[PDB]
Structure formats: structure tokens, C-alpha cells
Coordinates of C-alpha atoms and ligand atoms in Angstrom, one line a residue:
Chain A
X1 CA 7.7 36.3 11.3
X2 CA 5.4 36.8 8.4
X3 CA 2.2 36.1 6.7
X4 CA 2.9 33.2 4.4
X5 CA 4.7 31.2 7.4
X6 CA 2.8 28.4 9.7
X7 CA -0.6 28.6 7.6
X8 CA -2.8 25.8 6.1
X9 CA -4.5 25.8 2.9
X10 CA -8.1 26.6 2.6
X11 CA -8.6 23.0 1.1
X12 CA -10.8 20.0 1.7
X13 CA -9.9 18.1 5.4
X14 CA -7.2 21.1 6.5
X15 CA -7.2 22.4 9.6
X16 CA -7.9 26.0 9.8
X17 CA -4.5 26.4 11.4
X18 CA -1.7 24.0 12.1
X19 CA -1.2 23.1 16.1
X20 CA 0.1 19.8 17.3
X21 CA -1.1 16.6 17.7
X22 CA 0.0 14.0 20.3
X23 CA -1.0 10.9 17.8
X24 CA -0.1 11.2 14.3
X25 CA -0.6 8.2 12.2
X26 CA 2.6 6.1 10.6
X27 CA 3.9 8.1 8.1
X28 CA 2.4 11.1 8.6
X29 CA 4.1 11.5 12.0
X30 CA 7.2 13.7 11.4
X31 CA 4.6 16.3 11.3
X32 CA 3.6 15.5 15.1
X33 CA 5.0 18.9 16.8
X34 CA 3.1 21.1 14.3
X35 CA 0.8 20.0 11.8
X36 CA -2.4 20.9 9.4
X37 CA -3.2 17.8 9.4
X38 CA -5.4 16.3 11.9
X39 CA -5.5 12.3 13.0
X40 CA -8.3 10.9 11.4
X41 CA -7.2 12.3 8.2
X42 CA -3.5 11.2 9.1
X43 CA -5.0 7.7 8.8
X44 CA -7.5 7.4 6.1
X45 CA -4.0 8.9 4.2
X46 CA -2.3 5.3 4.5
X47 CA -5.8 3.4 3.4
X48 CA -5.8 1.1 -0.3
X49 CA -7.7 3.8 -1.8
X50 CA -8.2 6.5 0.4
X51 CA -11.5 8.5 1.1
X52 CA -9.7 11.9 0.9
X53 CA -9.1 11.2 -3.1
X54 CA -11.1 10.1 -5.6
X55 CA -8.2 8.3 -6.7
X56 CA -6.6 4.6 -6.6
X57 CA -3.0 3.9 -7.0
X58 CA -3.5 -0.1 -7.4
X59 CA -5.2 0.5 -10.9
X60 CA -2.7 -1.7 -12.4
X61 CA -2.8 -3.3 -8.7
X62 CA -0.9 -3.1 -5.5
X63 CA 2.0 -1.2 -5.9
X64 CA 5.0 -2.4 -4.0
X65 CA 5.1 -1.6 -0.2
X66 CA 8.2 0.9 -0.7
X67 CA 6.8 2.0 -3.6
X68 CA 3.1 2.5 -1.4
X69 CA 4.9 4.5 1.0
X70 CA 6.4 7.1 -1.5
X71 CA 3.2 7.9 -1.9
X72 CA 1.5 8.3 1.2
X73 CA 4.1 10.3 2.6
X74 CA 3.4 12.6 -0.6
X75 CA -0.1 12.6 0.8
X76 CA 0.7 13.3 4.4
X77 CA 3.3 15.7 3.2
X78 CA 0.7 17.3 1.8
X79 CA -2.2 17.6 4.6
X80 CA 0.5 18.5 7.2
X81 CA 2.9 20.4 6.8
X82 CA 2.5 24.0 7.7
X83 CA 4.7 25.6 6.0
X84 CA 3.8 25.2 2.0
X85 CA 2.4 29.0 2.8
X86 CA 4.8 30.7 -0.3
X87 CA 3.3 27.9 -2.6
X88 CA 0.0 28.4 -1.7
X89 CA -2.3 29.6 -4.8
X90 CA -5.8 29.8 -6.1
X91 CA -7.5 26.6 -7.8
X92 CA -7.8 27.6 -11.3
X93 CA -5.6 29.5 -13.5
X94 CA -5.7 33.3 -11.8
X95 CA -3.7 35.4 -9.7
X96 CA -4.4 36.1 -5.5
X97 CA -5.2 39.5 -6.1
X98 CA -8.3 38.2 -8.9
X99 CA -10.8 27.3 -2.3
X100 CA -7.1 27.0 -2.4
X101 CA -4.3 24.5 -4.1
X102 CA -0.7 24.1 -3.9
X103 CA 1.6 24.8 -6.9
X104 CA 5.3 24.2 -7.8
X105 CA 6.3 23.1 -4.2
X106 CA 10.2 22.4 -4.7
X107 CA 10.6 18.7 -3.7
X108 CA 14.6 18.0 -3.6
X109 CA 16.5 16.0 -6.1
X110 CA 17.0 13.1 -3.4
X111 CA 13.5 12.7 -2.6
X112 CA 12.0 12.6 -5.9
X113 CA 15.8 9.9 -6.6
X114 CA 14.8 8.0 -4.1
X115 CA 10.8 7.9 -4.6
X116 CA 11.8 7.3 -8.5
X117 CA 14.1 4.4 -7.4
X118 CA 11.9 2.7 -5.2
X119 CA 9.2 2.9 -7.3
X120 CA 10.8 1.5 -10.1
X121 CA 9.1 -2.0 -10.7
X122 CA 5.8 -1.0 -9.7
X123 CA 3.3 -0.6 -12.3
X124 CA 1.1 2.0 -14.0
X125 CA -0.5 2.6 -17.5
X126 CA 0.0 6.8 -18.0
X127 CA 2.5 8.6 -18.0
X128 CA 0.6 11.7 -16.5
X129 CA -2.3 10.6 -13.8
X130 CA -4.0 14.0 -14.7
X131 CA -6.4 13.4 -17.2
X132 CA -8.0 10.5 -19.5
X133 CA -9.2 7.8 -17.1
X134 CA -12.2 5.8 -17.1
X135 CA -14.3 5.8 -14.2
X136 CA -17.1 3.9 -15.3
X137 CA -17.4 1.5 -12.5
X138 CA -17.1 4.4 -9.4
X139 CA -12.7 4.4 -9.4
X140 CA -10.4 5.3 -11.8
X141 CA -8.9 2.2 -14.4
X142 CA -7.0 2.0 -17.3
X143 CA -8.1 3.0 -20.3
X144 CA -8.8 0.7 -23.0
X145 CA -5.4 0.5 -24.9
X146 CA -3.0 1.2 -22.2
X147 CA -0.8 -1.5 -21.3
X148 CA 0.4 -1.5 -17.8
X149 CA 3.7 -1.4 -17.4
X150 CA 6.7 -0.5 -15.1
X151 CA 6.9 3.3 -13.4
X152 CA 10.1 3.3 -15.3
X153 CA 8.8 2.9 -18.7
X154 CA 5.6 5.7 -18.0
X155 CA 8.2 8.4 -15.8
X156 CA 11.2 8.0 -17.6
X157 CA 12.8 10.2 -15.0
X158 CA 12.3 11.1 -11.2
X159 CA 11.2 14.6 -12.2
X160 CA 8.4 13.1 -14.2
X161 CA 7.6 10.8 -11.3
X162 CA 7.5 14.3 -9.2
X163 CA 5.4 16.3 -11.4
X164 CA 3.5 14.1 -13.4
X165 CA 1.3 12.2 -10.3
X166 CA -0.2 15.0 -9.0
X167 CA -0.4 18.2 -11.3
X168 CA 2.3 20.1 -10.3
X169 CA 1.9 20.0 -6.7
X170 CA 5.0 19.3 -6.8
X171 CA 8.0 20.6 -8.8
X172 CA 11.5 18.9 -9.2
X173 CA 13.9 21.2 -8.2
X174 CA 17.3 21.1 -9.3
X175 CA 18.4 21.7 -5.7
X176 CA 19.7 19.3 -3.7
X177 CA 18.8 18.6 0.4
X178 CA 20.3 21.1 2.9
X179 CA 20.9 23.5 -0.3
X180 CA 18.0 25.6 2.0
X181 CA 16.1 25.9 -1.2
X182 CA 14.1 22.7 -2.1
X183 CA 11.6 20.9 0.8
X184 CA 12.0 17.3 2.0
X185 CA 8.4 15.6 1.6
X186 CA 9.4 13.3 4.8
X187 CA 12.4 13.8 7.5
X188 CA 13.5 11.8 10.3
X189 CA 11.9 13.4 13.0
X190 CA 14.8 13.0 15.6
X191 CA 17.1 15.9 13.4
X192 CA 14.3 18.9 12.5
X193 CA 12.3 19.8 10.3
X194 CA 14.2 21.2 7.7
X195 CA 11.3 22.7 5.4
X196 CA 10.4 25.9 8.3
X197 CA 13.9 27.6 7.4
X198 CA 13.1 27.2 3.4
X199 CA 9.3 28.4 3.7
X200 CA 11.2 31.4 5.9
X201 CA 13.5 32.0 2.5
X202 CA 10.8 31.9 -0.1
X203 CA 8.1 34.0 1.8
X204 CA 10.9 37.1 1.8
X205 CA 12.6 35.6 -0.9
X206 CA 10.4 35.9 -4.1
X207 CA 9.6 39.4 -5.1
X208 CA 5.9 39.4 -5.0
X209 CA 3.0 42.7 -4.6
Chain B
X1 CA 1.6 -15.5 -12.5
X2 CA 2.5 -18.9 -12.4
X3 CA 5.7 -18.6 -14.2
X4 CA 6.9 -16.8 -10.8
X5 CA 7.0 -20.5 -9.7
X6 CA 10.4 -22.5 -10.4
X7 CA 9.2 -25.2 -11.5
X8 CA 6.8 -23.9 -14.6
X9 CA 10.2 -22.2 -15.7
X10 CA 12.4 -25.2 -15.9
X11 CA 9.0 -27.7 -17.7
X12 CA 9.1 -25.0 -20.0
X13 CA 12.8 -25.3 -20.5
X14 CA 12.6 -29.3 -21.1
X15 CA 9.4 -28.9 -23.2
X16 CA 11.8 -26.5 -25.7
X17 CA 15.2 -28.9 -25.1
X18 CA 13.9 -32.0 -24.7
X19 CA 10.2 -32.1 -26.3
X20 CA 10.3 -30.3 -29.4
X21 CA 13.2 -31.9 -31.2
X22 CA 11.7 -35.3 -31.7
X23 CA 7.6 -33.4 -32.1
X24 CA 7.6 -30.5 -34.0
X25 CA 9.6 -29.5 -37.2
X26 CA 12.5 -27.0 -36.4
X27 CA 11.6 -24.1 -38.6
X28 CA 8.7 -23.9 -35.7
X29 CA 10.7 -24.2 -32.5
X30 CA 11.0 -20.6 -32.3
X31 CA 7.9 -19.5 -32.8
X32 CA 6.0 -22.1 -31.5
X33 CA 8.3 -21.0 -27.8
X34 CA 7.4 -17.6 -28.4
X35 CA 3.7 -18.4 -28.5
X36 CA 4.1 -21.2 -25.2
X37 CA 5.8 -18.0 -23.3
X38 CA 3.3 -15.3 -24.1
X39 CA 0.3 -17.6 -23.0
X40 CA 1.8 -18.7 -19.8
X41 CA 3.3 -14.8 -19.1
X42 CA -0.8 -14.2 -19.7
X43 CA -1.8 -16.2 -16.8
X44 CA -1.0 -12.5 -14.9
X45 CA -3.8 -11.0 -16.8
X46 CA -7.3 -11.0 -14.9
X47 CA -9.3 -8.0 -15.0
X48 CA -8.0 -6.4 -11.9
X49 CA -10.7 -5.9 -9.5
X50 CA -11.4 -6.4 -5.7
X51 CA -13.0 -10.1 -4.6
X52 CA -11.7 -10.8 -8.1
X53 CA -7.7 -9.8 -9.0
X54 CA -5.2 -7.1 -7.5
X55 CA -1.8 -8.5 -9.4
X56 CA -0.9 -10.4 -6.1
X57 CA -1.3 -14.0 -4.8
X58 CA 0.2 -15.4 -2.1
X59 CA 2.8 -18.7 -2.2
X60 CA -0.4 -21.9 -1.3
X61 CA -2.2 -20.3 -4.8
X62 CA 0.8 -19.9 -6.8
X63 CA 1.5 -23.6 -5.8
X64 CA -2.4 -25.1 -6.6
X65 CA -2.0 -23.2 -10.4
X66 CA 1.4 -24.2 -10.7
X67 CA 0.4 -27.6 -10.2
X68 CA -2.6 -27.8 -12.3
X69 CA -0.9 -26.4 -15.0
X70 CA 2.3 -28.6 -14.7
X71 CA 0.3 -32.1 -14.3
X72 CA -2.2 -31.1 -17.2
X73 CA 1.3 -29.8 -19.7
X74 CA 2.4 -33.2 -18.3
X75 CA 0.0 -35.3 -19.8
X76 CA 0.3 -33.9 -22.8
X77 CA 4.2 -34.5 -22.9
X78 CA 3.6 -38.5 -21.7
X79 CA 1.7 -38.6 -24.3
X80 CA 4.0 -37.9 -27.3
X81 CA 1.7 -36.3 -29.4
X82 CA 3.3 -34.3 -32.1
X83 CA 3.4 -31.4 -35.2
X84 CA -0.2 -29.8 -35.3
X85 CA -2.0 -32.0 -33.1
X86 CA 0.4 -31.5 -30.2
X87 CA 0.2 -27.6 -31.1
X88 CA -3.4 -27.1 -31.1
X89 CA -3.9 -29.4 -27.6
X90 CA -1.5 -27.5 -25.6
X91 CA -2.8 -23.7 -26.5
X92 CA -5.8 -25.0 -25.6
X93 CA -4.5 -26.7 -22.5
X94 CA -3.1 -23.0 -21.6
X95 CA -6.1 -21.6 -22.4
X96 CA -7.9 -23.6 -19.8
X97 CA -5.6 -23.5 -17.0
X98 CA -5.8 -19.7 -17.6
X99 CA -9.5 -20.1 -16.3
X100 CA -8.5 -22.8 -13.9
X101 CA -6.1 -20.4 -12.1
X102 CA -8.5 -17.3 -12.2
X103 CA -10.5 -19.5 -10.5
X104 CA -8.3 -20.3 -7.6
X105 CA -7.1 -16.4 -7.7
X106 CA -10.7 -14.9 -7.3
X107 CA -10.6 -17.9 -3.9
X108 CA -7.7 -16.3 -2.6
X109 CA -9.2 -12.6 -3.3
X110 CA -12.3 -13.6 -1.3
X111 CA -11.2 -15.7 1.5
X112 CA -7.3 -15.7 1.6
X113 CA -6.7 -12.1 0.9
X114 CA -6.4 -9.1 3.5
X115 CA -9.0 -11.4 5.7
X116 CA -8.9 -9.1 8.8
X117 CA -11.9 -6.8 9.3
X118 CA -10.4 -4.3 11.0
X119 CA -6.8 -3.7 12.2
X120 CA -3.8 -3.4 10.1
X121 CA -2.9 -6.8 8.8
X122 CA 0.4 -8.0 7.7
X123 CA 0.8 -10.0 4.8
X124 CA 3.3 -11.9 2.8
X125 CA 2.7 -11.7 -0.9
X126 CA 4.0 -12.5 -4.3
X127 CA 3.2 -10.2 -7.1
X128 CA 2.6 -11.7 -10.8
X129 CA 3.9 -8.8 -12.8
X130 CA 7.4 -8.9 -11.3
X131 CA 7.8 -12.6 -9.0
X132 CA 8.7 -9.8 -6.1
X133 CA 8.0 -11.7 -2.9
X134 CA 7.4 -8.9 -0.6
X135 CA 4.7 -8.0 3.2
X136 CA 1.9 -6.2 2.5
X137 CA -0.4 -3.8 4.7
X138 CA -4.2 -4.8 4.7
X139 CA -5.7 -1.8 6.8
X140 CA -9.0 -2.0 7.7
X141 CA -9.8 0.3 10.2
X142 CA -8.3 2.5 12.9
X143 CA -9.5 0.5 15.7
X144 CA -10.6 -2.8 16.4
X145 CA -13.5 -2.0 18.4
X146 CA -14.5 -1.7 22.3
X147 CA -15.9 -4.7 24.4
X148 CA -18.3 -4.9 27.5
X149 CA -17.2 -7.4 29.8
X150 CA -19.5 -8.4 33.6
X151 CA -17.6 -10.0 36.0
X152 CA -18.7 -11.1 39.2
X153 CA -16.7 -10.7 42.6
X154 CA -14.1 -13.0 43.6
X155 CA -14.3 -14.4 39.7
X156 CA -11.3 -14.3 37.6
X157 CA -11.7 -11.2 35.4
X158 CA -9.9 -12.5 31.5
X159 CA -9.9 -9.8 28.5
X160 CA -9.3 -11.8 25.6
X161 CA -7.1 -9.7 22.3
X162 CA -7.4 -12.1 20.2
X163 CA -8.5 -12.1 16.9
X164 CA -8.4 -14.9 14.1
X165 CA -6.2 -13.2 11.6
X166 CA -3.5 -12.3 14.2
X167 CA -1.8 -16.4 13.9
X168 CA -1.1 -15.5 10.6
X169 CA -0.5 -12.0 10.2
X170 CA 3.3 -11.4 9.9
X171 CA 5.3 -9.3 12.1
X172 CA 3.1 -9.3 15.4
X173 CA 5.1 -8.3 18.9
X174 CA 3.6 -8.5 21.8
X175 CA 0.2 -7.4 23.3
X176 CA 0.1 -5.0 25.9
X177 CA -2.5 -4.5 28.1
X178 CA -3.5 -1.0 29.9
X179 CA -5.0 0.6 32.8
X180 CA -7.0 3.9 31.8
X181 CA -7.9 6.0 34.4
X182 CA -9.9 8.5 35.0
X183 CA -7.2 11.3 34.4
X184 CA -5.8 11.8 31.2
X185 CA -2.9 8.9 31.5
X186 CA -2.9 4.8 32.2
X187 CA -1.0 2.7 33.3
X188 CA 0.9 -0.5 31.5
X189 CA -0.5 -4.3 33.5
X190 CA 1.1 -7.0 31.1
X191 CA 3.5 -7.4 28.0
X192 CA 3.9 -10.5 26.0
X193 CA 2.8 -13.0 23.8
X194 CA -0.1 -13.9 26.1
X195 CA -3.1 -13.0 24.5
X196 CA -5.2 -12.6 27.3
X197 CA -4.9 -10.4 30.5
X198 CA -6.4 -12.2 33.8
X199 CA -6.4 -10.4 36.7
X200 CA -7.8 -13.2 39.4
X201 CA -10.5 -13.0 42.2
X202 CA -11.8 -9.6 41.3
X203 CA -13.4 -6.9 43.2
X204 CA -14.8 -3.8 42.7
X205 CA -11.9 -2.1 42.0
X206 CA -10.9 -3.5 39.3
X207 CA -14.3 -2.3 37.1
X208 CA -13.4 0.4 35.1
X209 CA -11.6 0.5 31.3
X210 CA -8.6 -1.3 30.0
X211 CA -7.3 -1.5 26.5
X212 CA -5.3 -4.0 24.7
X213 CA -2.5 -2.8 21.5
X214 CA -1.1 -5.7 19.8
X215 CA 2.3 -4.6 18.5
X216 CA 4.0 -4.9 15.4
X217 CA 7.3 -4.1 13.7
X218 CA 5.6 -1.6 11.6
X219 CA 5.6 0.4 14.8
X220 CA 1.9 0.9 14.4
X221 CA -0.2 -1.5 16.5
X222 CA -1.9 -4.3 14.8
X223 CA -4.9 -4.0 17.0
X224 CA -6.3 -2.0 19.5
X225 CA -9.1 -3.0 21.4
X226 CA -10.9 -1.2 24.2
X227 CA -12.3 -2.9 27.1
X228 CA -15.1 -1.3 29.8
X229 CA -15.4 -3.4 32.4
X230 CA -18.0 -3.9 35.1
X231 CA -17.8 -5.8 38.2
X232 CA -20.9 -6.7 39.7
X233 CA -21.4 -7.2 43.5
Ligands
NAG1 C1 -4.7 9.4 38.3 O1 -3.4 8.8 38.2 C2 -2.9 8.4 39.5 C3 -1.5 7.9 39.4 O2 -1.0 7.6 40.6 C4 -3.8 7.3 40.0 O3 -3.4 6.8 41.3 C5 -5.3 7.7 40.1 O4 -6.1 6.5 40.3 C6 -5.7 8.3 38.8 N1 -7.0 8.9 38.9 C7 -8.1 8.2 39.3 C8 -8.9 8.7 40.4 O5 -8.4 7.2 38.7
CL2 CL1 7.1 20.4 6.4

């Protein structure tokens, strides 16, 4: 056991602790046996834009369903999963030992191929959603000289796709699946959960006070 | 987005093969195609906003502005107008049917468009930055709500799961109806396309709560509706 293992964030809709949850929502249900995440939030994660964000994904309209689904399993990914504990890190720029975020989380190569490939003809006008867009009518839009065009033209590659849409959240490892060293954002639920045995590695892995 | 439609794509073909040779001097063909393809490729820009434009329409509006636009281009090409006459009609034929089809688009948007309030709604699409015809997920809310229903002994008790949108959503299976007990668990009545459960003649022990769960493929129902239901003596 350890410290950094089966722990939530101290973040917005988390759950002080992960436990199950008979009725996970869609996506978000890998997660089922053991997650932060709790139902309600495991739903409003699959809405057009999404109450837990301030942000929309359609601003240069619906993205494509498989493209969609990328991101919501991102999203549930993200409110779920109880083991992101080595990532876990003050919001700001600051060390632990001087509200919570998650930082450099090591998405493999395949899921950030695959989210890159079937994201492909969807559209978007930045190529890095952190930063200059105009909310003057309540959502995010496209700022005035930004042409929208494909997610292949704004994230020339999947690791820009990766790290680019959510500040670093996520990293793109070089790793591939089953390396033991880089997390799956969504697994078929029937094989395991492969992320506990890589939070298990990190947590005694990295050299840290 | 009507040059997602076939048939825009090959009058634009004939207009640059057939048309221009005998209307327009050839040092212009070119750029006078150029120009055509820009301003029907701009049909796809409305300022993307809900009840207004979100880059998708389905197939009955892409028909309606492919129409318009075709029969108007039409009349234009019957009427073998030609050189700078013929070029300043039809940009201003394009410009108009640009309005004309923002018009039928902000319809669809209000009426046509995700129409179900509440549920998860299924719905084919075609989307005008790419011509990718592809089902889309229009969810609403968790739930579709609970229902009271009184139902007098020995009169047929019927819990209707119906909804308006469900027709022409895409991808429906088949609703199931359930007993909820008391405990923790409940039991399964009826599966299948009926959209109604009836249990016949009913008496006091049939009061209590049943809930309907219209399937789908997405293997998330389409709608779930609760049921309490009363039987009075
Ligand atoms: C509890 O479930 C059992 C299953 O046999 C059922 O018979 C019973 O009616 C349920 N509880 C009540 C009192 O509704
Ligand atoms: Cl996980």
C-alpha cells in the first residue's frame, strides 16, 4: 500500500474518496468497481457543453461523434479514476511542501494515436484551448481572425492533441500500452484496469521528499 | 453546406463545361470558377450559435437549399445571359440563396434539431464543413420524468412510454417495463416494441411503482420513465 494510491483530488465535483458505484453513466463506466466520480457528475460529463466546465467543444460546432467521445472519456477519465494520486499537485505554480490539479499524467502513445486519428476531420480554430478566447456572449468562441479548421491542421500531432486541450493534464508519453509506464484514459472493462499497477510504480517509483 | 449535395456539384460542373464557353470570355473561366466555388463553399458559414447554426443539418434541409439554389442558378442558365451581366446576376443570385438557406437552417435549429426535451435522442446528421453523414447524441436530461396514474378496480391499468421524438429517433430497441418493489430490486413485466404496458382488470395489488427504459444501441436507455401508480377501490 501507500499514500498516493486510491485517492481523489481535492477538486471541484470529486468525491472525497473513491468507492464504487452500481450505475456509472456511458462512458464513464469502466470506472464502475472503484471510482471518484460519482453518477450525477458521470452524466452531466457526456452533456453538449457540460456544467462541470466552463468550456464548449462545438465552438466551431458539433464535433464528430467519435471525435465527441475522445473527449468525454478524457473527462470521465478524469473525475474517476482513483489512481492519478502520483500526479496529483497544487493549482498554481508551487511545490506540496509550499485546491488541487492534475499535472503530466502519462496518457499512452495509442490513446492519444487513436483520439488524434479519430479526431481528425473535426474542427477547431487554436491550436492550444488554454488561453485567448472570447467569451463575450457567456461560452467560449472563436476569436475574431481564427479560421476554423481541421484538428489536423491546429494539432499537427497526437501529442499536441494530448497536451494542448487541457493544460497539461495530460502528457504524451513515449511509452506504449502494457509498457506498465503510461495510463490508458479508457479500458474495456471485461480485461482490468490496467492504470492501478502503473499508479503502484510511479508512487515508489519517482524519488520524491 | 449545400455543395454536400450531388447535385449542386455536378450544375456546377455543367455551368464550368457546358455554360461558360459560349458566355464568358476564356481568360475569365478560371477565375470566374474560383469565385462560383468560394461563394457556394460559403453557404457553411452562419454564425454558429444554438436556435441559429451548429455546422450540421440534416438530409430534408440540405434538400430544400439545394433546391432553391439549383432552380434559381437554373434560371439564370435558361436564360443565356452572358460576360458581365451574367457575372454580376449570379454572385448576387449566391448571395441570396446564402440568406435563403440560413433561413431554412435557423428552422431546422429550432424545430428539427435535437427536438426531444429530455432523454438522449438519436439523430442522423450531415455536417457542412466535411459532407460526413454521421448519428448524433441530443441529451437532454438524465431522466424523462415520473407519472401519477388512478386506476379504478377491475379497469385496465395502461402506462403509456411514449414520447413524440422516439418515431424518429434512430437506434431505439425495445421498451421494457418494470416492477419496483419495496426491497431494493424489481422485477422485469414486458419487452418489446409495444409502447405501452396493460395489465387488465386491476386490483389492489397492482398499485405500487413501475418504470419504463426504452433501449437503444448506445447501450444507454433512450428514456426512462417512472410510474407510481394508485388503484382506487
Ligand atoms: C421483495 O422481493 C420479493 C421477491 O420474491 C417479492 O416477492 C416481494 O414482494 C418484495 N418485497 C415486497 C414486500 O414488495
Ligand atoms: Cl484509472
Amino acid at each position: 500500500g501507500d499514500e498516493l494510491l486510491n485517492i481523489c483530488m481535492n477538486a471541484k465535483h470529486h468525491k472525497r474518496v473513491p468507492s464504487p458505484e452500481d450505475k456509472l453513466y456511458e462512458e464513464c463506466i469502466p470506472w464502475k468497481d472503484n471510482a471518484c466520480c460519482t453518477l450525477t457528475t458521470s452524466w452531466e460529463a457526456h452533456l453538449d457543453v457540460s456544467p462541470l466546465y466552463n468550456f464548449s467543444l462545438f465552438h466551431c460546432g458539433l464535433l464528430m461523434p467519435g471525435c465527441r467521445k475522445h473527449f468525454i472519456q478524457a473527462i470521465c477519465f478524469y473525475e474517476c479514476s482513483p489512481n492519478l494520486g502520483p500526479w496529483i499537485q497544487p493549482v498554481g505554480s508551487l511545490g506540496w511542501e509550499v485546491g488541487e490539479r492534475v499535472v503530466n499524467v502519462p496518457l499512452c502513445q495509442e490513446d492519444c494515436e487513436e483520439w488524434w486519428e479519430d479526431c481528425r476531420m473535426s474542427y477547431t480554430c487554436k491550436s492550444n484551448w488554454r488561453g485567448g478566447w472570447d467569451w463575450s456572449q457567456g461560452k467560449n468562441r472563436c476569436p475574431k481572425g481564427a479560421q476554423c479548421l481541421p484538428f489536423s491542421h491546429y494539432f499537427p500531432t497526437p501529442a499536441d492533441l494530448c497536451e494542448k486541450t487541457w493544460s497539461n493534464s495530460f502528457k504524451a508519453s513515449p511509452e506504449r500500452r502494457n509498457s506498465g509506464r503510461c495510463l490508458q484514459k479508457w479500458f474495456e472493462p471485461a480485461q482490468g484496469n490496467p492504470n492501478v499497477a502503473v499508479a503502484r510504480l510511479f508512487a515508489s517509483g519517482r524519488l520524491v521528499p | 453546406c449545400v455543395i454536400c449535395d450531388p447535385s449542386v456539384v455536378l450544375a456546377l460542373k455543367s455551368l464550368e463545361k457546358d455554360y461558360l464557353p459560349g458566355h464568358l470570355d476564356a481568360k475569365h473561366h478560371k477565375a470566374m470558377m474560383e469565385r462560383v466555388e468560394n461563394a457556394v463553399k460559403d453557404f457553411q458559414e452562419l454564425s454558429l450559435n444554438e436556435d441559429a447554426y451548429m455546422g450540421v443539418v440534416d438530409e430534408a434541409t440540405l434538400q430544400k437549399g439545394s433546391w432553391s439554389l439549383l432552380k434559381d442558378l437554373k434560371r439564370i442558365t435558361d436564360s443565356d445571359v452572358k460576360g458581365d451581366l451574367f457575372v454580376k446576376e449570379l454572385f448576387w443570385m449566391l448571395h441570396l440563396q446564402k440568406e435563403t438557406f440560413a433561413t431554412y437552417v435557423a428552422r431546422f435549429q429550432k424545430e428539427a434539431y435535437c427536438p426531444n426535451k429530455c432523454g438522449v435522442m438519436l439523430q442522423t446528421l450531415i455536417w457542412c464543413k466535411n459532407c460526413k453523414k454521421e448519428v448524433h447524441a441530443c441529451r437532454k436530461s438524465y431522466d424523462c420524468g415520473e407519472r401519477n396514474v388512478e386506476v379504478p378496480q377491475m379497469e385496465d391499468m395502461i402506462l403509456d412510454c411514449e414520447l413524440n421524438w422516439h418515431q424518429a429517433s434512430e437506434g431505439l430497441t425495445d421498451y421494457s417495463f418494470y416492477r419496483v418493489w419495496g426491497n431494493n430490486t424489481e422485477t422485469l413485466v414486458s419487452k418489446g416494441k409495444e409502447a405501452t404496458l396493460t395489465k387488465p382488470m386491476v386490483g389492489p395489488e397492482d398499485a405500487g411503482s413501475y418504470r419504463c427504459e426504452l433501449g437503444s444501441v448506445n447501450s444507454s436507455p433512450a428514456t426512462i420513465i417512472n410510474f407510481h401508480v394508485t388503484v382506487l377501490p
